[PDB]
Design a protein around this ligand. Structure first.
Ligand SMILES: [Cl-]
Ligand SMILES: [Cl-]
Ligand SMILES: [Cl-]
Ligand SMILES: [Zn+2]
Ligand SMILES: [Zn+2]
Ligand SMILES: [Zn+2]
Ligand SMILES: [Zn+2]
Lengths: 188, 193
């Protein structure tokens, strides 16, 4: 038996080595980290402190209001490890929209697009999101339940549990070097 | 009397004996029965060549392990997607008076990275293919991944589109989330457009 990493935050669970990694990802006593990806903010705090932190320390992150929006990522053929981030406001919540370009597999630059709720895991379960890329007679769609920012996105990226494509695919969908991602959030 | 210069059909070497004035050339050729087509089954094993109409018979007689499902909206189950031997899954779909070949391929296109590629091609011409769309959908616990495009024609083939990632492309990790007991169901819907 081993204690959870977040024991010092008030977590009581002791588990064997094999059950430890799964619990801590989903543990409630996990700190809410600055949800903006991926370097180099090291801020942590409570859920109610997240939106003010973004507003005070990440002023260039824009918000669009609506359930049905276009997240237009500019200059997607910019080389290397890039992030695009915006927030979407609907249903009384803010959602973090992230497009990340990273060399997850060696020699293969890929894009990962994912939505997170600024709120709890329990709250996140009432939502669904759709990410849709549109091209000339082409459409690529991903639909899932948004991750709570509590969980982060590193695990979903590693598991490809989000929309995954690459620079090859992106060319079908890009217009003037930009990528329009249709993001629809709905309740279930 | 000087008659005007005649042109042999571009499929003369395949047998076509008709010669024609230049204006009739394109109109005959894109209708000519002697046009050769390679075997559309992936990939390099079969060396058969023949007419468009000889294709589906070739697949029925020489590629008996390929199943044909009937209907515009089907499920293709790719079994044992995790087996190390497993490379290709092929199925035919019959609807709208045509036959469409669904191909799933597992490969390391980038070294060290195993990916699945899925695509549809029409047993027919590009012109015929351009009146269709196809949708591939993977379904899991609160997850859905969808790709929609115009079917490839068999003359163009699918190898080039796969190389370009102009098809459904996904990882072995996410394949697992969509798989049940080692099998991956792909919903395929063909539509007119
Ligand atoms: Cl809709
Ligand atoms: Cl799950
Ligand atoms: Cl439908
Ligand atoms: Zn814990
Ligand atoms: Zn921050
Ligand atoms: Zn001819
Ligand atoms: Zn053959």
């Amino acid at each position: 038996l081993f204690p959870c990493k977040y024991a010092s935050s008030g977590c009581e669970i002791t588990l064997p080595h094999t059950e430890k990694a799964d619990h801590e990802e989903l543990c409630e006593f996990r700190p809410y980290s600055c949800p903006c990806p991926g370097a180099s903010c090291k801020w942590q705090g409570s859920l109610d402190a997240v939106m003010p932190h973004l507003m005070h320390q990440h002023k260039s992150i824009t918000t669009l209001q609506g359930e049905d929006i276009v997240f237009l990522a500019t200059d997607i053929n910019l080389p290397g490890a890039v992030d695009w981030v915006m927030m979407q406001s609907c249903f009384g919540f803010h959602f973090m929209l992230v497009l990340e370009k990273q060399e997850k597999y060696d020699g293969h630059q890929q894009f990962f697009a994912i939505v997170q709720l600024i709120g709890t895991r329990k709250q996140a379960e009432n939502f669904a999101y759709r990410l849709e890329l549109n091209g000339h007679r082409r459409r690529l769609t991903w639909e899932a339940t948004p991750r709570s920012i509590h969980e982060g996105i590193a695990t979903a990226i590693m598991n490809s549990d989000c929309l995954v494509f690459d620079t090859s695919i992106a060319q079908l969908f890009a217009e003037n070097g930009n990528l329009g991602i249709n993001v629809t959030i709905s309740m279930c």
